Amino acid sequence: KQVVTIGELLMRLSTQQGIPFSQTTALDIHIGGAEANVAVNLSKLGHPTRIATVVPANPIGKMAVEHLWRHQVDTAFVVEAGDRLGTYYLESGTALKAPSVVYDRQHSSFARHKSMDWDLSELLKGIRVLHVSGITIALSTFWLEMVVKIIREAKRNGIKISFDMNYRAKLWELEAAKRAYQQLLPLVDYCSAGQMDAVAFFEISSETTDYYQAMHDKYPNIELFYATKRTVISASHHLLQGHLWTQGECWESEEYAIYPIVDRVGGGDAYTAAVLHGILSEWRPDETVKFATAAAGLKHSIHGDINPFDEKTIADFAADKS
Amino acid sequence: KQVVTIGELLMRLSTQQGIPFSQTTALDIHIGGAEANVAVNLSKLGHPTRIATVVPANPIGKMAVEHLWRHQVDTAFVVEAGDRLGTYYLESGTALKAPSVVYDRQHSSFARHKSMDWDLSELLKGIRVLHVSGITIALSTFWLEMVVKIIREAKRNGIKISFDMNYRAKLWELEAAKRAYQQLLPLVDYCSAGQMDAVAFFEISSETTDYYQAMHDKYPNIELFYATKRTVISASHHLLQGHLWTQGECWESEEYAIYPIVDRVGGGDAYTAAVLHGILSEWRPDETVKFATAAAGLKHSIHGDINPFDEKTIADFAADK
Amino acid sequence: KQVVTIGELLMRLSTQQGIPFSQTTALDIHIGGAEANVAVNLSKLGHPTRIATVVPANPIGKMAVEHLWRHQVDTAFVVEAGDRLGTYYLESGTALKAPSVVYDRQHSSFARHKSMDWDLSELLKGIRVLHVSGITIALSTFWLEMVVKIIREAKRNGIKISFDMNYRAKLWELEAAKRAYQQLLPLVDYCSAGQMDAVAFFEISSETTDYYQAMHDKYPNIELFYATKRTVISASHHLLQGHLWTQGECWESEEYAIYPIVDRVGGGDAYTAAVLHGILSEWRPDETVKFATAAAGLKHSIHGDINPFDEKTIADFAADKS
Amino acid sequence: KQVVTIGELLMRLSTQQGIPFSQTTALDIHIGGAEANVAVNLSKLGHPTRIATVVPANPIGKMAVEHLWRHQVDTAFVVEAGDRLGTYYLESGTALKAPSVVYDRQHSSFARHKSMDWDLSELLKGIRVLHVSGITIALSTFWLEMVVKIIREAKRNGIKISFDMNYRAKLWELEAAKRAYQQLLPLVDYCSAGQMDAVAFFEISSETTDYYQAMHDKYPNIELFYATKRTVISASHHLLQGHLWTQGECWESEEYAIYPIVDRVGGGDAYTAAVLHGILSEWRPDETVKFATAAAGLKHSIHGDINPFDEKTIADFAADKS
Amino acid sequence: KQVVTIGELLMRLSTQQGIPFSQTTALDIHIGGAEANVAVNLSKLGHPTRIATVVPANPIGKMAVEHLWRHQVDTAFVVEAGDRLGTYYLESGTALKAPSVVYDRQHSSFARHKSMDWDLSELLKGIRVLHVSGITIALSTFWLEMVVKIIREAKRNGIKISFDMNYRAKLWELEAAKRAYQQLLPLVDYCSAGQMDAVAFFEISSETTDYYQAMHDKYPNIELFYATKRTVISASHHLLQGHLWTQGECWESEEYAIYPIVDRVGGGDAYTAAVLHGILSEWRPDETVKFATAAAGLKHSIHGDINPFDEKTIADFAAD
Amino acid sequence: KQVVTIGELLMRLSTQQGIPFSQTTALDIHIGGAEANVAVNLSKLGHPTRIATVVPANPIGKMAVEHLWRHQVDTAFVVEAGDRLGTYYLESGTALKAPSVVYDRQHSSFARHKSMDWDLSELLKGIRVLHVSGITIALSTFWLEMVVKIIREAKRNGIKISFDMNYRAKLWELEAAKRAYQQLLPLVDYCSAGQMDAVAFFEISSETTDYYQAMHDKYPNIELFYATKRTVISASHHLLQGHLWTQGECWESEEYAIYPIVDRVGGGDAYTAAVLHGILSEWRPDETVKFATAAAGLKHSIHGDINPFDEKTIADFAAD
Ligand SMILES: [Cl-]
Ligand SMILES: [Cl-]
């Protein structure tokens, strides 16, 4: 089954372990972006994927396109426009010192794009699932409205809608995010959202124990919720457990202890891609949460945004756990 | 003798020798900017310098400021504002393949700045020379008009004005630049301008042999012109010779053959700083052009934007070859 | 215009400049191979390409496959078989000291392969040119035989044949190579071959000034020959000039001086790809040889096997010299 | 408020993780020195600092000076003389293998210096605290007596005295050290001393649980002691807890678990500088000890000798652990 | 006391921490091999060592030889032949991700060797201990029979036989290996072998508790058994404890917690060499097991196959 | 034929190309020293060599020793003593910018040595040639006198004396040097010296054209002189030609243009070892000067102090 996604690619520029911005003489490059990571990760698990996106017509934009080709993501729907690819700087963290990020994504070709450049019948042909996150819709009114527009056209073709809340304080205030999420949520089939999202965006009280049930109660259209519970002990030591709620039941993976941590970035996108894989493969929910959590766990040992492992490697690891 | 400059600092991100953008997995970092480079270079030669500039209040902007501290450039007139430090990417060149650049300087804190945040009584106190380049005035109407205002105030106080043409095609059209240069040129004392500048912006004829003389006729206020003549044989082999015109005569250094080339970036800025150093030390024109060309030559052997050598090292090389 | 090729992919393991094997602590990796480099270089110039080849079903085989995806070479006709990817070690050379190689390509999946795993009608569907080199047919009788079949099949379909003599002493002795070449030569349209080839394989006396006219006389079928004239001054200083002969006239490029030299490997494949490009573009001879020599010259400035430049970048450089 | 310090700068030359001296092909460089590190760290926190020190008038000595500039420590009192900058080699440690050091600091300019080249009225002008360590006074009888002469001039002018025991087996015998310490301690206001110090140098029975109270009885002039309690589990796993004793009370921070460890070097200097910052800002004991332990903890995540964090970053971290 | 060994050297090509094969642009080089590592590690502890082995006459073969010179192993019995040095690729593991290997050792000079190029009275001259492992004998029948001949001759001379089982499933079948081990075990004095070995090759039921006693009973010729008990929590966290059995008593070290892990490769070879060192120095069994476990644990902190520490350093750590 | 040398090993710490001291964050390590380089280079050409030297008993001293083991130089005559290994820093040079050096060799274990810790009969056993340079004798009166003492014992045993003037202004003034050279020269068989040496230390006038003949006249015991003529165009472009004088003739190699230059350090030592190799192999002078000049030329392409090429590789290059 084929999947389409919508999202911005960024170049991440990272310091080496133990080196602060103020002492760095070189930066490691990684191409990534929430939705693009999900496309790459899905393609790793055998799903043909495609992404509607925008890059500048320069060598840096071309690196982003090359990243897609390398991981076999269809680039037919990459549009060339604007003046720059967005970037961010990441200062490595270890032990007591948390990673630190400086964004430089504003004014990017994507963020500034205001032109309807996609033939929807074409973008959506043969597609089973459409995936997008709250990062994209936060970038601008044009993007919020474009995404809704595309969601609706997809729903009319019976395409399933996957939505990753992915709230980023750095991108918008809780109230604006909330207004926007309330326009998307009634249109979603599969939703990545956790307890914090429940309280901030679903009017759920911090008090309620079964928040997934109350989230479904508010938006009965949502068949399935998925997220990880992360316990941050330090920048080098997390506990990680997958949750997947559907049909009135929460299914949980085993809890993994991850230490040390090579690179947590994209850990969430690995999880998301792995859940969608299980759904598309029509697995039982226990099988899906177990596989997806193993995938996200393994991603933490790999520098860069995307998860390099094939399905067999992930499955084998999930089976050793039990 | 103190020198003040005005300009934007950029972070350069470079590939390693022989590696194209498409295969690079890491980029080397260097902080620089034409006027900032001149400031640093002058500091290395014993001149207290300061710079009026703008950076974001984030760790990346802090990197630019720390670069100034490291090289003993006064930072009291650095202004924090905006959301980003401008950058550019540089793909290494060697042999037949020229270096290649991709700018990402737009929307920088400096470029977007529209606020008069400099106390001029303070900025210009104790100052002997003010230096600025054509890159700064190409960025916006505000910077063009801001530099003009500081210039006029500067002259009022008997401060000498050093102006580096530094036309960049990727910043503006010849016509726009021409109009702007026409506002600055009448205010300049020491001008870094070459043969293509004379044709381009001085309305000088292409045929004319004594361009410096004719440029001076056009703007009699300009006491001295300085440039290098670069012969580009390959990305790894240049010939370099310094020119310095004043009082009706061109003075020229010996011609250096530079090969291979480690990093030509900031080579012009090393020249510019070394010329200014000579003027400030009241050297003769022959001593100055000689010293400055040696400085520029040595810079080509050093990765990054600034010239690491002290006067003695530069002078010993110049007197050597 | 599509091109298909046949050839082995190797992993090159290279020392850094000034570091001999005996002092090296790390080796840089590059994937490459004469035909694959031509494929990749043609793709860089806008020609859809595909390649018939063999790699093991392991992570190292996979790296060769990923190399192809990265550069948009079709991999549908990559076959997975055998036990190892061929490799070779390269010790960098500078100034008086020449580069030095230790091959480790024996027993590669490609070299060992004895199975007819290609559907010829699929492989040649929509193909305007078939390219292959002396390396491939030297590897075994199976490969010589396979190349012959495929050419005869291509020839019947109106497909042009491109052939790189690419004689390698390490792979076979003159006598064997010559008998092999004598089967292919009457079937070639475009031929990369130089004076040593003429003397070695075209039966031409070394006393003949115009060897190209004589080689053409031996084989009136070959519509053009191409090659570079390399003057080795040192490991860091070469002169390079392109030749292209067709219809009774040798056309020459300017002679470039190349110093220093970053990486000469694949310079010949850059030249080949560029010449084929000019042919498929139906350019004039003087334009082609000018373009292709610039391409090959620029390639010397880039680590690894393939030429990273686009057409406009090469053509801009070619037009600067004169 | 302004601080003066006295001490030698060293160039540290470090192997990479997991690489022993016998296999290293490059060494990473860091400039440091107990007192110099304290100066840099104070300056990070807003305190103008200056340092009386000696370096050779050569490019290596210059690196030491440029390190001071970069971190805005006043260099007006750096004296150029002698033949060499002291160095030491540090072999990385991880897990069971402890870091290993080899000093190459004898015969340095600082070590051999015998000249009184500092105008004291200028050196002590506008100063509130003078800081020095047992490292400096161990280097020579000249430095021992020079530090004594300065502290005495300082004390006349109403300046507080900060002393860091910092006993080094490598530098001297306990008894000689003991005798030197007996000259300094009666003269100190703020002492960095642990229980090891208490037993070895303050003649406090190792039975004694409240060693600070006994140390105070011995030296009633000492207003407050400070130190970290370090529990070494391995070279990659330490527990760290700050202690600060003043007017009859010991005040503790939370105990931090640090793992892995990036670079413990200079962690004590980060603690020392943080404590002094708190003393200078007139914070309460519990504030200072909490802030300083956090500063020291974070330093462990950074390669090199100095702490790169600003006050807000440190304060925010400290506030999160509560 | 001098030690001789027999074994193949391989070049290991490794990715850096956190980098998969698919993204690596360079590979770090390490020379090693089970028996070659034991030889180097013994030399580190003051024992003159030598190794019977085969490398190609090319620059890569030469790297293997210079590795031996660097570490003062005698190379008089290195033979040059064949076409290639065997290699393998190692993809780093950290935390949940286990390291992974791709072997490229087949058709190696050592593997394809069929020529008896060693003067045995010279190779064994002045030697106190002969060491070899299950890796060598698995490579070819030629090597199996070569090793047997050499053990036979070594025994006539009063030379002690050290054997490391080192079963590698990739090299041969359980049944094929069982039959080789049966010809060797009756000839062994010091044996590196664990509970899995006891069940797989000594025909002991997985039931028996005191497996070493049962192993001794099967082969009363074996004076000492040694092995580590390793508990893998993750790729970055192992527990490690040494065992040494002799005269009907097992002797155990303290259990070490190792984390993170820099490079576990050659950890067992470090253990083997240190045990042999203790035996040759005539230490008590408790000193030996404690010393060798310390040695093995420290090796985990060092990139590469060999243990760079001297006796004093290892001994100081064991005592602290 | 075996060779003994006497000299100090230094650790060289270098910046990478285009990086000045002021911006470097790491330094590359190379072990070397004029005489130690000669010993290593001779070993590469098949001669068993040994070196009398001193290093500290610490891990840095050990790196110097491991360097010798790796290149098969005998270390039985390395003595451990004192507090530090000498070092120097080298700032890379390219094109117009010459490399720049800062020495940190004073107070080294070797520099400060004052104890006769060598059994001369053992040091010289089996030796055909003894080599030393003006660097060693300049370090202290102890080393000057110790070098003479060893030379004399060597001559009593028919050993040939190879001396490399190698005057270094950093180490001593011309007068003191000349004094010392005047004790050594009457004892030398093979001498590395050029025209500047002739004027400076042989008291030849800068008028004489045939300076070697005049130098021989003064010291007829000197069978042959050898040196390179270097023309420095830039830090990345040198011309190099070898000279070799014997039996009243100067033999010159072809002239090599070297560009770019990877690392000139040890270039002279490569020349010296290759010349000695030719002498020991009893080659004709034209064969020797051609081979040695090629050796020295190839060295310029290799990072570090020592020449990695074998004889066949150098000979093949010379023949082109
Ligand atoms: Cl770690
Ligand atoms: Cl170069």
Side-chain angles (χ1 to χ4, degrees), chain D residues 11 56-61 82-85 87 104 107 109, chain F residues 8-13 21 32-34 37 84-91 99-108 135 139 166-171 265-266 269 305:
Chain D
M11 175 172 56
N58 72 25
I60 312 292
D83 291 320
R84 79 184 292 275
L85 189 79
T87 63
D104 190 9
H107 313 279
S109 302
Chain F
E8 183 173 16
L9 280 73
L10 301 175
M11 168 163 65
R12 198 209 324 160
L13 302 162
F21 286 135
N37 298 342
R84 77 183 295 270
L85 189 79
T87 65
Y88 67 108
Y89 304 89
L90 188 149
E91 193 190 63
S100 162
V101 164
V102 180
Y103 271 99
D104 189 8
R105 70 180 308 154
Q106 311 196 12
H107 314 286
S108 70
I135 294 168
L139 293 183
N166 226 318
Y167 172 65
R168 302 290 191 85
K170 253 73 161 295
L171 299 174
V265 175
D269 308 319
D305 270 46

Side-chain angles (χ1 to χ4, degrees), chain C residues 102-118:
Chain C
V102 184
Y103 270 97
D104 188 5
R105 67 180 311 153
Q106 294 199 294
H107 317 289
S108 72
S109 296
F110 188 102
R112 282 260 214 175
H113 205 74
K114 288 172 312 169
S115 182
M116 214 325 185
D117 294 326
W118 297 265

Side-chain angles (χ1 to χ4, degrees), chain A residues 295-312:
Chain A
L298 292 171
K299 167 61 195 65
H300 283 65
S301 300
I302 301 288
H303 287 298
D305 276 49
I306 63 82
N307 205 20
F309 305 108
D310 63 16
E311 175 182 357
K312 164 77 169 177

Side-chain angles (χ1 to χ4, degrees), chain A residues 1-3 46-49 126 128-129 279-282:
Chain A
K1 317 195 184 173
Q2 311 193 45
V3 173
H47 303 273
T49 63
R128 178 61 199 164
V129 168
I279 294 165
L280 293 166
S281 309
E282 301 179 1

Side-chain angles (χ1 to χ4, degrees), chain A residues 18 31 34 39 43 52 71 91-92 104 120-121 124 134 166 198 219 229 231 240 257 260 267 274 276 280 306:
Chain A
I31 305 299
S43 169
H71 295 291
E91 190 183 67
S92 168
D104 189 7
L120 297 195
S121 65
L124 294 185
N166 225 318
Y219 298 103
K229 182 193 171 196
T231 308
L240 192 70
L276 293 175
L280 293 166
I306 63 82

